[PDB]
Amino acid sequence: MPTLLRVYIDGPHGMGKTTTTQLLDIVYVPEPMTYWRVLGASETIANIFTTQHRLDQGEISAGDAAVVMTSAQITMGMPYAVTDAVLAPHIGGEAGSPPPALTLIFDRHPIAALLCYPAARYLMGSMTPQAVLAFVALIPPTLPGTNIVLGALPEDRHIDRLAKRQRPGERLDLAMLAAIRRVYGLLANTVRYLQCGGSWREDWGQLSGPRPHIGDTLFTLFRAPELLAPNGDLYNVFAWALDVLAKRLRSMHVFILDYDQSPAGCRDALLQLTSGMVQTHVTTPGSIPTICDLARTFAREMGE
Amino acid sequence: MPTLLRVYIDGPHGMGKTTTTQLLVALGSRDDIVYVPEPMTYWRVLGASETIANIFTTQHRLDQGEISAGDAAVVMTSAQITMGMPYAVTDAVLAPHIGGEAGSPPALTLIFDRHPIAALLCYPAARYLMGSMTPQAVLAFVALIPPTLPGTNIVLGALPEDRHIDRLAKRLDLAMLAAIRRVYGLLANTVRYLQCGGSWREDWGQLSGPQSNAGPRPHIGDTLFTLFRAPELLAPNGDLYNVFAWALDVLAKRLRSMHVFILDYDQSPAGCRDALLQLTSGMVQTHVTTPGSIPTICDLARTFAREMGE
Ligand SMILES: Cc1cn([C@H]2C[C@H](O)[C@]3(CO)C[C@H]23)c(=O)[nH]c1=O
C-alpha cells in the first residue's frame, strides 16, 4: 500500500508560511480564504479584527466580544475540520524512519483554529477560557504522521513582514501578534514537555508555588480563575479538557522552520525538514488519487 | 474481557427522558449501572452564566425583531458550543476505553442523558429551522462530531404532539417544539436510510419542493439531508459547494454505525421504564480496552454527575 507524507505548515502568521509553501507527487491544501470571506460567512476576518478593536476602545463588552469571537472561530476552522474528517479514514499506520509516493502539504492544521487562535483571543480578553477548552475538547484525534512545522522569527522582522502582508479586513495589532507568538512558543514547549514525561496533574502545584517547566507550557493559561472552584481546584470538566490536550498534542511531531531569511532559503529549509518527518501507509490502493482530488477541489473552491 | 453497555437517551425535551432513565437506574445494583445526567451546572454556572436562559431570550428577541438574524446566530452558535462541551469532553476521555463490538450481562452499564449529537446537530439544526443559526454553522458543528464509537446505542422518543404539548405546558416556544420534534424524526430516518444502503450523493437530485431500526428505506426528503438544500450552500451552478458536501459525508459516516431504538413515552413512568428495559435487550455491547477500564469509567460518571448534574 502506498506511503504518504503529511506536512502541516503552521505557527504564527506573517512570517512567510504562504510564500514558503507557494515556492514549494506533492500537493497543496491552501488557505481557505474564500470560505472565510464568502462561503462560510461574510468577511469573517474583518469581523474578528473589527471586534477586537472595538473591545479595546470600550465600545462593546468582554462578553460581547467573546460570543462574536467564538462563533467566528467556528467559521474559521471549518475547512480544516472537514478536511481532517474526510481524510482520516485514508491514513493508516506509520512507515518508520525511504520514499513517499505522495506528499500532502497543508496551510495550517485544525489546532490553529481550535487551540492557538482561541488561546490568543483569550490572552486578548476577547474569548472565555471555557470556550477555548470546548474547542480543545473537539480536536480530532492525532493520527500517525502528524508533522507540524512551526516558525522562528525575531519579533521586529516579524512585525515588518506582517505589516506588508495584511489580509482583507485585517488590522495590524501588535498585542495580538505578541499573544499569537507566545501561544505558539508555549505550544512547541508543551509537545516537548509531554514527549519528555511531563504530567500536568503532577506538576500543576508548581503554577502557584528534563523538560520545560509547566509555567512555559500551554497549561499555565488554564490556571485562569473562571475554571477554578472556590477552593482553587480546577473543575473536573476542565481537567478532562487538559487531559485530551495532553493526549492530542504529545504525539505530534513538531518541526521548527527559521523564517529569518529569503523565500529561497525558507523554501529549501522546509524541504530539508521533511527527512526527519514521519510518513504513513494509506488504507486503500485508491487512497492517493482521492487525496489529490480532495486537495485539488479544496484549492480550486476555497483558496481563491 | 469484561463487557460494557452504553445507552444514550435522547430526543426532544419534555417527553419523560430524565424520569425514565432514573427508574431504569433504580432497578439496578449499586455499581453495575451508572447514570450520567444532564450537565445543568455546567450550563448555568461552570461554562458560562445561564446558557439556557440566554438561548431563549435571544430566540424571543429575534422573533420580536429586536435583534437581527446575525445577532441571533452569533449567540446560538456560541451558546451551543458551551451546551455541548461536557458531552464532547466525556466522549473524548471515554473513547480510549472502548473496544470492539461483542454481541447483544454487562459488567457495567452507562445510561447517558443525551449524546454529543444533541448539542452538535439536533439543537443547532432546529435553531437553523427557527432562523437563529446559519446552515454553515450547523455544518461546522457536524464536521466536529467525534468518531462514532462502537456500540453507540441511541434511544429516541415517540410522543403524539398533543400529549407532548400538554406535558410541556408545565415561555413555551411551540415553534421550537415542532422544530426539535421534526429534527429528531429526520435523524431516525437518516440512520435507517444510511443503514438501508442509501447514498445521499446518489439521491441528492431527488430533493425539491419515524422508525430507526425497522421498515423500508426512507426517501432522502425525509432525512436530515433535506435541511441543507439552502441557497447559502449552493454554488452558482446549483450544486452544493464541496465544503458543504464533505460535511454531509461526515454526517453519513457518523450516523451509519449507530444503533438507534425508539421508546414510546405515551405511557406511565413505570411503563416507560419497562419498555426501555425490554429495548436494552437488543443493544450492542463492547469489550473495554483494559482490566481497569470499568472502575475508571464508573469514577468518570460519578464525578460527572457530582460536578455537573446539579
Ligand atoms: C487560522 C486563523 C487565522 N486568523 C486570522 C489571523 C491571520 O493573520 C489570518 C490569516 O492567517 C487572517 C486570519 C484568525 O483570526 N483565526 C484563526 O483561527
Ligand SMILES: Cc1cn([C@H]2C[C@H](O)[C@]3(CO)C[C@H]23)c(=O)[nH]c1=O
Ligand atoms: C442539549 C441542549 C439543550 N438545549 C436546551 C433545550 C432543552 O429543553 C434544555 C434541557 O434539555 C434546556 C436545554 C439547547 O438549547 N441546546 C442543546 O444542545
